[PDB]
């Protein structure tokens with residue numbers, strides 16, 4: 001059951017700008033997504049202070065990076081508060097019009113792409129390294145859904161009947177560009193995490209697949 005929706009024009013504009021920029025420090029995308037994951041974890045932790053039962057859907061609080069070399073996909077999963085179906089339509093491709101507009105003005109004046117997070121739209125930095133993204137999300141008291149975009153003007157939201165269950169949280173599935181496959185490598189991922197994400201309150205877990213020999 002696939003619903004199609006249109007991006008707020010300014011958000012479409014930003015995605016095209018980012019997916020085409022030739023910027024040289026693309027590794028900062030990972031800091032931005034980890035930062036979004038930390039913030040989502042802050043929110044479920046806030047609710048859990050009043051109501052500890054909110055954690056029961058996924059009791060471990062974590063950020064997990066899962067390279068899928070077979071698929072040329074990098075996944076970033078958290079057990080944060082997550083997003084309902086309405087959130088996915090709204091937060092993504094509607095809200096943040098204001099931040100996208102200001103960021104684009106700053107870019108024209110010379111701003112570093114790396115200050116995207118200061119306008120609240122660092123999520124879209126993923127298009128530095130990916131040409132296609134799926135956002136899978138599960139909020140307490142709603143079903144699991146998949147939001148999907150290819151940096152054009154349309155996105156879809158679907159009940160998720162094909163991915164592992166998240167329990168609670170969000171998983172971004174980045175379909176990496178052919179020149180950015182370095183971010184599937186354990187050594188590269190560790191470098192970037194250690195450089196740019198030292199002060200994160202939650203464990204950052206790296207899933208690595210090794211042959212037994």
Ligand SMILES: CCNC(=O)c1cc2c(-c3cc(OCCN4CCCC4)c(Cl)cc3Cl)nc(N)nc2s1
Pocket residue numbers: 036037040078080081082083084087091092095096099120121122123124135170171
């Ligand atoms: C509905 C309550 N939960 C949320 O809004 C969440 C938003 C996210 C996000 C997120 C945040 C995002 O925005 C960051 C916050 N800014 C948005 C507007 C100003 C602040 C964007 Cl544009 C996209 C996404 Cl997928 N990422 C992740 N990993 N988890 C959550 S949970």
